[PDB]
Amino acid sequence: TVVSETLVENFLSRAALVSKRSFEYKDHTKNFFKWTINTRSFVQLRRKLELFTYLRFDAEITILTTVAVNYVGLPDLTLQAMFVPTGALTPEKQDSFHWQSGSNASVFFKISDPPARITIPFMCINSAYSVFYDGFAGFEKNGLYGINPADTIGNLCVRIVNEHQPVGFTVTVRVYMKPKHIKAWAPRPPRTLPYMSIANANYKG
Amino acid sequence: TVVSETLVENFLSRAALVSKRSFEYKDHTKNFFKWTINTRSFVQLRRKLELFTYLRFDAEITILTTVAVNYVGLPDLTLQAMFVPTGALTPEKQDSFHWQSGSNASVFFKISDPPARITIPFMCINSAYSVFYDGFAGFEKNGLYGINPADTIGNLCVRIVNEHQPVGFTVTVRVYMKPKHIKAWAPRPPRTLPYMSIANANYKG
Amino acid sequence: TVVSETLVENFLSRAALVSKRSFEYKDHTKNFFKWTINTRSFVQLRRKLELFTYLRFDAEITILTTVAVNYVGLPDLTLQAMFVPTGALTPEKQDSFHWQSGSNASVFFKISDPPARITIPFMCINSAYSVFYDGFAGFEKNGLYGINPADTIGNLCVRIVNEHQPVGFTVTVRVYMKPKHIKAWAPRPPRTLPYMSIANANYKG
Amino acid sequence: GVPTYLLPGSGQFLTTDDHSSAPALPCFNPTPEMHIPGQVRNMLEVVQVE
Amino acid sequence: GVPTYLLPGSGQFLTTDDHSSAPALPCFNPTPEMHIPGQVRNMLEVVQVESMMEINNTESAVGMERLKVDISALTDVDQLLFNIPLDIQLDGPLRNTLVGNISRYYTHWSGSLEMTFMFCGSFMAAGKLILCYTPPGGSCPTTRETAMLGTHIVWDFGLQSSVTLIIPWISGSHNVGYVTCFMQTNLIVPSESSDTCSLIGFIAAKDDFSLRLMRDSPDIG
Amino acid sequence: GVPTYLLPGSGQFLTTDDHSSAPALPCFNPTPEMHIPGQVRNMLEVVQVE
Amino acid sequence: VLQLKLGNSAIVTQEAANYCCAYGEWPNYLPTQPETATDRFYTLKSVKWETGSTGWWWKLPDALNNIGMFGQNVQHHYLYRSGFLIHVQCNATKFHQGALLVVAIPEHQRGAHNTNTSPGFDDIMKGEEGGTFNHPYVLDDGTSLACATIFPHQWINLRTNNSATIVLPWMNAAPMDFPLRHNQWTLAIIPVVPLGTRTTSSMVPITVSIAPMCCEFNGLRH
């Protein structure tokens, strides 16, 4: 018993895991993953950001790679993390050139090293992101409800640089995102009811 | 035969091992440890701090990890050291999300690297820690004697990031704590008699 | 055919190996060494320092560890080099706590890394070390001749942090000492005759 | 150059650390900031509301 | 950027090193510091406080009477009361004190000490004593006059109720000093007062007492 | 922070190098220096003696 | 001879000068006050001190839980911070010999002999009755009595001075504390030298007075 830290900048900024995926790799004789890096998946960060309406921040992405065992020993793989911004169409003919195009930003990192850390700037047509968008997607007149085409950051694409390695090890990739330079507007009420789906606001009760 | 170093800051500040534990790992087909990081366990640091009543310091935690052999060779594991502050309830459903919540501070380090070193700030309701507390825990009227609920730093939780690795090696973790910015008040007499229990001051003689 | 470097500071200061030991390690189903780090053992540094009477310097200790083979491959061991100052009694109950006491200064280093380098300060009761001491040890009246109890630096204790590793490799440790801030007094004649024993000045001829 | 030595705990990943990192898309200018009513710079302003 | 090269001994973990590390919980403000009486910024302030010497240490001596030395009225003239060794590491009367317990964390100790004696007997107790100190290697006194060759003072029960003794700068590190006390005259007490009186010794440290070279306490418990 | 790159020959141990290293026992004050007759700061003074 | 008058009462005492301030400070106000309501010295029950008396201890404010006017405000308000002026006067003739050590132990954790069981509520808080030292040589906390002088203390010798006055300011980590839970100080009278007399057994009374000077209260209820 018995204002510095109360600031919004320190409140919304924390390191959390927004994506968890492990691809099975044993014998292929492909391996890759892409995701829209959105805050509606991880449940604790979602409700954390449901408090505010519009948000302005720079996403800081850090990729942590761990290799498990399914004594051989752990070889050192080379991984490539590429960020695909919104507007780049993806006609995937893998084994050939899209990844290696100089337009998209890519980073190379080994297994044993400081985790790869990149800072994504603020990419928007409008002034800030829209967490709550009342309306429909584009002008289709019946277009999708609850999704604003104006705000899409892009897709995070990560693959292994080296060719097939004859091991039965499974590669585990963890992606942490800590926002910086956070600006808040229009605080809203918290949502006590559970999340039925990430696509809209429907509640069960 | 025949005052700089005599200062309290240099006297109480030294690197000592406050926790020693090694979990047996061979075949699981879990692995983790948490402890309250208190100074009453290690016997030389206890009596070292029994000289003074109230203490104000910032704990500096350093985790040293060594892998033994029960020639294969030593793979490089990825470990996660998370600090759980006081007030966070622990309903452990392992294999799922508590560890990875962005609220608790976590650090990642490999086996071969400089030892992970973090500085825990001063977390208290009152002005300084209480080594000698005359009274009872909370208000239960018969509540526990000798333990002050006002001062609890938290629990240090460490687990391996990677999944099960098919080796018979045992991981040994060593945690050293060197306090800094030490402020002392009310020196007391040393205790010559041995320690019967860490929960109270009872003596044998 | 046909004063900067002639200075005493550059003359006495050089990197030399004062201790060479390799412990046999194959199967134990202990491993450690301690020595008084004195200059009377290595023959070239002894006569190098027999030129002067009193000396004031700060010993700089560097531990170089190499692992031989008695293809498996070389694992990375974790070693602990602890310095025991004069006055600390050694009741060794190994496998338990003396090494890990926070009073003695310890350092941790891996096999592959820059060599561990520490600088031991000047620890003496008097103003400078005594290479030539005419008298007896303490006051025993018949106490040992040729050894001054006033000057003892301590013992250098080094052990492996990890537990027993099932390999037949032998660990070789090399300790180099380069003195710094050297101050000289009372130069003496060189000793041409060989050294019969390191405990006293007896000559053969 | 400048001789340096690694401190204990170098290269680890901390969750609460704050440091500058290399930007992903250089030479990109974000949209300027329009004035949006109800700027909240502190969480106590939300709490003080009845 | 700036080219750098690793120095020998980089990345090692030292126990005695002092460096800044990344904080675990940023944007956290610790509780402000209230003023707490008795702030101790130096360990010498604890040592300078007087402490109780136990002079009664003998066979079958346990408990409260180890702090006092019984003196009856049946004692004779010139009888040795006790001797106090000055060795801190060994066990004298100084084994557990404020100066002794703190010095066991160190090795080299140099400084001047002080001893204070207090007579707890009745008010009417008469007689005189002798208080002498032994220099290092000082030919420990057989009876009396050998102790007189050094620094000494005649202390009376009636006049002074306390003793102030300044000992000149002993030294020790890893038989030197002593304190000799005898009976100058007989103990004179009235018929109503008790025959047995006692004393309590004290020791403190002066301003020149110095310490260094931290180590581990030899006593585990 | 400050980007740096390792120069060729970094991390090696040289015998003749002179650099500062971390002290083993901090907060320790060595014994002050009393004046000792016959201070020799150069090896030529010993040689010049007959 | 000099009477110390505080409030509506007073007690005849020895000349009071150069009184001991604990850790060299005095109980100032925190940067209503009971200079009238609860002010006057509260004299506890006089304990009989004999040759075989080990000692006594009164925790603060354990002996004061219900005493006079101060007993009302203990359970009445939510928090307080209070200083203490302790005057222990032991009356005896010139034919009695002995010594009494009055020392104030801040944050005293008691203990038991040869068991790991922690004491209960009735063993810690005894109220006004007060306890008795089980083993005063070890202070019952496991420490030693020889080095126990580090605290504030005064010496009562039947030769020089038969009374002692110790002033205790507010010692706590928190600015205020709970009345019935935590005990900040402890008052202990340690008979280092036992009693001795011509007769086989005698009785020497001891008077203890405590003044809660310069305090405050908050959390008015009831």
Numbering used by the authors:
A (entry chain A), B (entry chain A), C (entry chain A): 47 to 48, 54 to 80, 88 to 128, 135 to 269
D (entry chain B), F (entry chain B): 1 to 50
E (entry chain B): 1 to 174, 188 to 234
G (entry chain C): 13 to 43, 54 to 244
Task: Provide the authors' own sentences about this structure as they appear in the paper.
Enterovirus D68 (EV-D68) is a small non-enveloped virus belonging to the D species of the Enterovirus genus within the Picornaviridae family. The main structural features of EV-D68 capsid include star-shaped mesa at the five-fold axis, narrow depression (the canyon) around each mesa, VP1 hydrophobic pocket directly beneath the canyon floor, and prominent three-bladed propeller at the three-fold axis. Binding of cellular receptors or treatment with acid trigger a series of conformational changes in the virus, resulting in two expanded uncoating intermediates called the expanded 1 (E1) and A (altered; 135S) particle. Here, we show the discovery and structural characterization of a two-MAb cocktail for delayed treatment of EV-D68 infections.
